[PDB]
Amino acid sequence: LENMKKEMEINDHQLSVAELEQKYQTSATKGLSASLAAELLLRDGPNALRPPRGTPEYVKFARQLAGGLQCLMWVAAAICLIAFAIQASEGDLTTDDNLYLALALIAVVVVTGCFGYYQEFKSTNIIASFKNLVPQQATVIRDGDKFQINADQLVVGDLVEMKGGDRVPADIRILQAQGRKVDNSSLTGESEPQTRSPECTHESPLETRNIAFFSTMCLEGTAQGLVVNTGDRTIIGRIASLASGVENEKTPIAIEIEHFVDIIAGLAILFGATFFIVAMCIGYTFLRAMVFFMAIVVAYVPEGLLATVTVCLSLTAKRLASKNCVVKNLEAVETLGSTSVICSDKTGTLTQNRMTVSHLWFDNHIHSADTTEDQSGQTFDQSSETWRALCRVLTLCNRAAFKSGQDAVPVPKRIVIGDASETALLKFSELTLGNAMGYRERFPKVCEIPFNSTNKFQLSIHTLEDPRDPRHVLVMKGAPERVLERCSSILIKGQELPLDEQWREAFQTAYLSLGGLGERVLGFCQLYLSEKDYPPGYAFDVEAMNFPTSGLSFAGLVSMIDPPRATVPDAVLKCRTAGIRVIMVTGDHPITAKAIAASVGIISEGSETVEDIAARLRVPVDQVNRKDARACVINGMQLKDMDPSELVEALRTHPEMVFARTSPQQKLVIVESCQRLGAIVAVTGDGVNDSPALKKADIGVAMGIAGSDAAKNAADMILLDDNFASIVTGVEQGRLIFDNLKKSIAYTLTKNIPELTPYLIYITVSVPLPLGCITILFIELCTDIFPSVSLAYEKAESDIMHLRPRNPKRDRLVNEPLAAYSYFQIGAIQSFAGFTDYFTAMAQEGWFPLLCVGLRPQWENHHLQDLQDSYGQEWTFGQRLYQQYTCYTVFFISIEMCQIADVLIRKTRRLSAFQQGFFRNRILVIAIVFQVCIGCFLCYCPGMPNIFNFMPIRFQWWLVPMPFGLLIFVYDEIRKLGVRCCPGSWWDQELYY
Amino acid sequence: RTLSRWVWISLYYVAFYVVMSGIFALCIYVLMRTIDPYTPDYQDQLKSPGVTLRPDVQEGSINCTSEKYFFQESFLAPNHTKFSCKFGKPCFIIKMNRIVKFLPGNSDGPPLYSLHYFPYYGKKAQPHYSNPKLLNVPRNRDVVIVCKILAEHVSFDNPHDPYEGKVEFKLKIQK
């Protein structure tokens, strides 16, 4: 399947022209026969790519319904519904109870469902991004005569002709070309035009001049070439197939949740069967033991949980959007908090993807211009007389012009018409000099000899602006060696000086050096033409050297470089502090890639690749211990050859890696290599060449503006801003929530125990049911909701960036220490709080607790209007029921009172309420007040007696759980203190989340 | 799952649940202190008396007549047991649900309490304290009947405790 696509291509550029036909069954001059073109059409198929096999029906809604969690709620709803159906066996109360519960469950799955399904309904789309560019016709030669045919018709063997402007229809072997240039950015990510000639330039097929690739567009010139490959078979076609057809998989948060549901179920079963068996030994048939087991579901399963996690995830995502960080998926909020390594594309990601100027040599000194977009750097030199003279030639001996109508946009940002080197000079001068146009105007261009291929140099003759001369000035530029050949003198400072052999090499030095920077160099000189020889009028001949070309005054040298985005070197540093490995992966050449690597902080001071050391040592490389090199830079042509085990070692071996000149399949390979290690890898990229890797990465991040549609589709996240620094914020939004979520789990779970125990005691003790099904739903659906959600607001107890990424396998979101804490300790304190209120209401009523035992049959007995309390009085069915209902209400309230404590304690794992300040979280405090207020409402509001069987509570009743609440706050607070004091041992080991 | 260290668990809970079954019981035995032996803190629940019946759906003592309320004194132990007054076509018997210190107030179909007893003193105060027919023409059919009690003190809750101050039963007598 996909695996073959990962391998690099193998070709036929070495083959002779004649040989290629022989293989093809084609005629070079004439082209395939019509008959023969058809055949081959059927044999092979169309010259069309296999439509994006990506279409997940709107039926996908149904995917949010199931999950693992929603299941737990489904099975639970289904168990309720069964129970009901079993309660069909007689005339039952469940019309309010069991059917109501099972419907509530289903409804929480559905709602939660919907909600999820929306926050996600915003994304996807990839094939349609690719299709956004989708051939039309081709001109082919068949039977000696050319015609334009539907592009699908093209087959291997035929003759195709392409000119400047057209898109290469298929993979082609160039047989004939005049002055043709192509754009191969689809392959390389690099736009500058590449020659196409008939002779094979290199071994690599991607490199050779003789091949023109589909998904590429002939920039200029004209060519012809034989179709080697069609449709899926072309180099890019393979890339296409090798993309959308990807299985998205599970997120870590999603995994953590799944892993939660297992534990929870784990308990809900264990207990639920245990209560089948314990009820058996008591006096309960298969009729009754069974109804309990299923009964044991709701108490066990937090109905409110799914909702809370989502609103928590949604709430956090909102903060990030505020951040100019859009998140397509809710699950995406967390993932960032577990990125070990980042594989970053260089151009347009790390860098602005915007050529510029470099340095300068003059005054026998090397100068360094500011390359930055914002031009944050400083001013190298205004002073020098030489500098101006040099500026003059740069502005004057220059064709380029800025496009009209962006005086709005900044100089380095505006589009210029002209070659890159000439634009670089214009921008340079326009920035430090003032308007270029100015200078042009002021020194009108008489005549000039455009940059020839043979001359390797471009000159101009201008009337001098200085009104006292307006004599003629000669300015030229071109290959540095050529400009020197052409000079007698050198403008050092203001004044000319003989060009001795000493300067000849000081120049030769600079030229070498700048040229080592991986910069392109140009030489500059000018000549104040003798006015005797040239009259004001004087006519210049561009055709034949009227005027002097040799013995000119050599002004200076102009180099260039490349830069990144402002934020990026930092953002990189932050990530590294984060203990994240950053790995460059770029299509670009190695000299450039390494330079940027240094610039950004991918490669740190001191680091060294074998070859650097190599070179400082003065020693051959074989000689150099590999292990001495922390850093590595590997060309794609070398990476091709290597095994994936060899890749794994390189990866194991080096802290700072740069893969340069990599193909899209190689980027993919690196990532996979990364993942094999078992690290979580963010790929950040801008280009179509980044697609398979972005699509591979645990999280693909794409640039919003620069980014090609392809990258955007392929990605999980879009940096709308192209603000790399965002990536840092994104990683800091994947750790504060993960923890805050456990707090909300512990909070929600703790109340489960106060809900469970009353039903159990009810069976074991044979006492009147202390809490009802309805009462439970008010806690889970009403009261616990705000407080649970509110936990998301919680802050860091420590500097979170400082700790290492979580080992996904070892540190789970919900762990046994949470259960023990929620269930074993805190929940248990909660339950007694509830039970107490129970006893107080009945006792006050005339039913002392000792009398309570064994009573439920009489109490429940509908027939007995007679039930005698301890005092000796007699209560009807309804009467004592009202009291019981009051109990259900008070128990409900007792939990909310104990939930206040739980809320407080839950706010911090390590820290003391005092340190944190339970106080700052406004959302949480709001939870206590609204929570209470909901309870009071349920109690006080009239009609709530019938609708939810909630009865009014005396003021006294409110207090019962108070000592319980307070003990919880103390008991936890103590414990944490203990945990701070000895980090090493026991409390932390058992209890620490 | 530890090695060795279960002590530091097993001994833990021992004197921590211990501490917690010990505070809880702590809080109960305190509550219990602040209640009368003879009278509950709230009477409100029982507020209107309900009516219940025998059916299923002395001497010592004092001789008495049909009069006003007999006050025994306060509800205190300083006196010994307060003295209580003496007392086909089925026979159903109705009583009024005992409520301490409550003085009831008084000073077609198909075919079909003396004040001297109150106030009831309550069990602890009075142990053997006794609280105070369908001759019908039809036979061999279910008959729905409702018996109720009257007073200014008495109230009925038709929507709720159908018991409250009233009965509802279906008699049948198959001869």
Instruction: For residue A804, give Cα distances in angstroms to A118, A340, A794.
Output: 33, 9, 21
Tokens for A670?
């690196």
Residue A331 assigned to a binding site: no
Whole-number Å distance between alpha carbons of A776 and A80 = 15
Q: Which of A163, A137, A176, A153 is nearest to A32 (CA)?
A: A153
Instruction: In whole angstroms, give the CA distance from residue B37 to residue B33.
Output: 10
Hey, is A376 helix, strand or coil?
coil
For residues A438 and A283, give the distance between their C-alpha atoms in angstroms, rounded to a whole number: 105
3-state secondary structure of A357: coil
Residue A690 assigned as binding residue = yes
Contacts of A967 in chain B (CB under 8 A): 23
Name the strand (E) or helix (H) holding A447: strand A445-449
End-to-end Cα spacing for chain B: 73
For B16, nearest residue in chain A (alpha carbons) = A825
- Mention every residue, 6+ apart, whose C-beta is less than 8 A from residue A279: A288, A289, A292, A763
Contact B50, B153 (CB under 8 A): no
Q: What are phi and psi of A656, to 5 degrees?
A: -125, 105
Residue A828 with chain B: CB contacts under 8 Å = 17, 20
Token pair listed for A54? 């990506």
User: Phi then psi for A125, rounded to 5 degrees?
Assistant: 75, 115
Q: Which of A593, A908, A930 is nearest to A783 (CA)?
A: A930
- Pick from B27, B28, B40: which is nearest to A871 by CB? B40
Cβ–Cβ < 8 Å for A655, A630: yes
SS3 content of chain A, % helix, strand, coil (to 5): 50, 15, 35
In angstroms, the Cα distances linking A559 to A320, A480, B119 are 42, 11, 113
CA A138/CA A856 separation, integer angstroms: 89
Q: Tell me if B50 and A864 make a contact (CB, 8 A cut-off).
A: no
As a dihedral over the C-alpha atoms of residue A900, residue A905, residue A907, residue A913, rounded to 10 degrees, the angle is: 110
Can you say how many angstroms the Cα of residue A903 is from the centroid of all Cα atoms in its chain? 34
* φ/ψ of residue A35, rounded to 5: -65, -40
Instruction: Name A525's bridge partners.
Output: A476, A554
Active-site annotation holder among A12, A345, A562, A588: A345
Q: Which long-range contacts (CB under 8 A, 24 or more apart) does A672-676 make?
A: A672/A6, A672/A644, A672/A696, A673/A644, A673/A647, A673/A648, A674/A341, A674/A343, A674/A583, A676/A644, A676/A648
Q: What 3-state DSSP class applies to A620?
A: coil
Q: How far is A625 from chain B (nearest CA, A)?
A: 46
Size of interface A-B (CB pairs under 8 A): 107
- Residue in B5, B7, B24 to test binding to A, most A beta-carbons within 10 Å: B24
The answer to whether the beta carbons of residues B55 and B92 sit under 8 Å apart is: yes
DSSP state of A631: E
Instruction: State the DSSP H helix or E strand holding residue A114, giving kind and residue range, or none if neither.
Output: helix A98-120
Q: How many residues does chain B have?
A: 175
Decide: helix, strand or coil at residue A803: coil
Residue A75, CB half-sphere, CA atoms under 13 Å: how many? 14
- Domain A747-991: give its CATH code: 1.20.1110.10
Alpha carbons A223 and A217: distance in angstroms, whole number: 12
Q: Measuring CA to CA, which residue among A153, A178, A191, A183 is closest to residue A165?
A: A183
Determine, for residues A876 and B20 on separate chains, whether the beta-carbon distance falls below 8 Å: no
* C-alpha distance from residue A980 to each of A186, A594, A797 (Å): 57, 46, 12
Yes or no: say if A395 and A433 are a contact pair by the CB < 8 Å rule: yes
Residue A575 CB neighbour total at 10 angstroms: 24
Tokens of residue A933, six digits:
């207020």
Closest chain B C-alpha to A890 CA, distance in angstroms? 14
Domain range summary for chain A, segments of one domain joined by + = 2-48+135-241, 58-127, 331-352+564-731, 359-558, 747-991
The three-state secondary structure class of A752 is helix
Question: B136-139: long-range contacts (C-beta < 8 A, 24 or more apart)?
Answer: B136/B89, B136/B111, B136/B112, B137/B111, B137/B112, B138/B110, B138/B111, B138/B112, B139/B88, B139/B89, B139/B173, B139/B175
In the DSSP assignment, the letter for residue A54 is -
- The widest CA-to-CA distance across chain B, in whole angstroms, is 84
User: What residues of chain B lie within 8 A of the CB of A840, using their CB?
Assistant: 31
Name residues whose C-beta falls within 8 Å of residue A403's C-beta, 6 or more positions apart in sequence: A414, A415, A416, A417
Helix (H) or strand (E) segment spanning residue A454: none
Rounded Cα distance between A223 and A211, Å, is: 11
Under 8 Å between Cβ of A785 and A859: no
3-state secondary structure of A524: strand
> DSSP code of A814?
S
DSSP code per residue over chain B: --SSTTHHHHHHHHHHHHHHHHHHHHHHHHHGGGS-SSS-S--GGG-SPPEEESS----SSB---S-S-----SS-TTSSS---B--------EEE---BT---S----S----GGGPSB--TTT-TT--------S--SS-EEE--B---SS----SSS-TTTTB--EEE----
CA nearest to A556, candidates A782, A392, A327: A392
DSSP symbol at A806 = P
User: Which string of DSSP letters, residue by residue, matches A458-523?
Assistant: EEEEEE-S-TT---EEEEEEE-HHHHHHTEEEE-BTTB--B--HHHHHHHHHHHHHHHHTT---EE
Q: How far apart are CA A254 and CA A241, in angstroms?
A: 28
Fold (CATH) for A2-48+135-241: 2.70.150
Query: From the CB of residue A438, how many other CB atoms can be counted at a distance below 10 Å?
Result: 13
Is residue A419 flagged as an active site residue?
no
Cα-Cα-Cα-Cα torsion A290, A294, A295, A297, nearest 10 degrees, comes to 150
Residues A269, A298 contacting (CB under 8 angstroms): no
Cβ(A339)–Cβ(A681) below 8 Å: yes
Cα separation values, A584 from A83, A175, A189, A702, Å: 60, 37, 15, 15
Closest CA to A883 of A850, A851, A854, A840: A840
The CA distance from A125 to A563, in Å, is 32
A301 is in an annotated binding site: yes
Task: Report the residue from B40, B100, B123 with minimal CB separation from A844.
Answer: B40
Pairing of the two strands A326-327 and A717-719: antiparallel
* Residue found under tokens 């490669």: A603
Exposure of A238 in the CB half-sphere (CA atoms within 13 A): 20
Using CB atoms, which residue from B17, B27, B96 is nearest to A963?
Answer: B27
Element holding A61 (H helix, E strand): none
Collect all residues with Cβ–Cβ distance below 8 Å to B35 and sequence separation of at least 6: A843, A844, B41
Structure tokens at A588: 């670009």
Determine contact, residues B39/B100, Cβ cutoff 8 Å.
Answer: yes
Q: Write out the E strands in A769-879.
A: none
Q: Which of A564, A545, A568 is nearest to A486 (CA)?
A: A545
Cis peptide before B119 (omega within 30 of 0): yes
Q: What is the DSSP letter of A167?
A: B
The verdict on a CB contact (< 8 Å) between B50 and A871 is no
Backbone angles phi, psi at A951, to 5 degrees: -115, 160
What does the DSSP 8-state code read for residue A824? I
Architecture of the A359-558 domain:
3-Layer(aba) Sandwich (3.40)
Of the candidates A342, A343, A307, A391, which has an alpha carbon nearest to the alpha carbon of residue A111? A307
Instruction: Give the SS3 label for residue A201.
Output: coil
DSSP A47: S
Among chain B residues, the shortest Cα distance to A840 is held by B31
The rounded distance, in Å, linking the Cα atoms of A5 and A666 is 10
Beta bridge partners of A149: A138
Q: Is A832 in Cβ contact with B24 (below 8 Å)?
A: yes
CB A843 within 8 A of CB B40: yes
The whole-angstrom distance between A271's CA and the closest CA on chain B is 20
Parse chain B into domains and list their residue ranges: 1-175
Structure tokens at A193: 């035009």
Place of tokens 């550029």: A13
Q: What is the CATH number of domain A331-352+564-731?
A: 3.40.50.1000
- End-to-end C-alpha distance for chain A, whole angstroms: 43
10 Å Cβ neighbour count for A618? 6
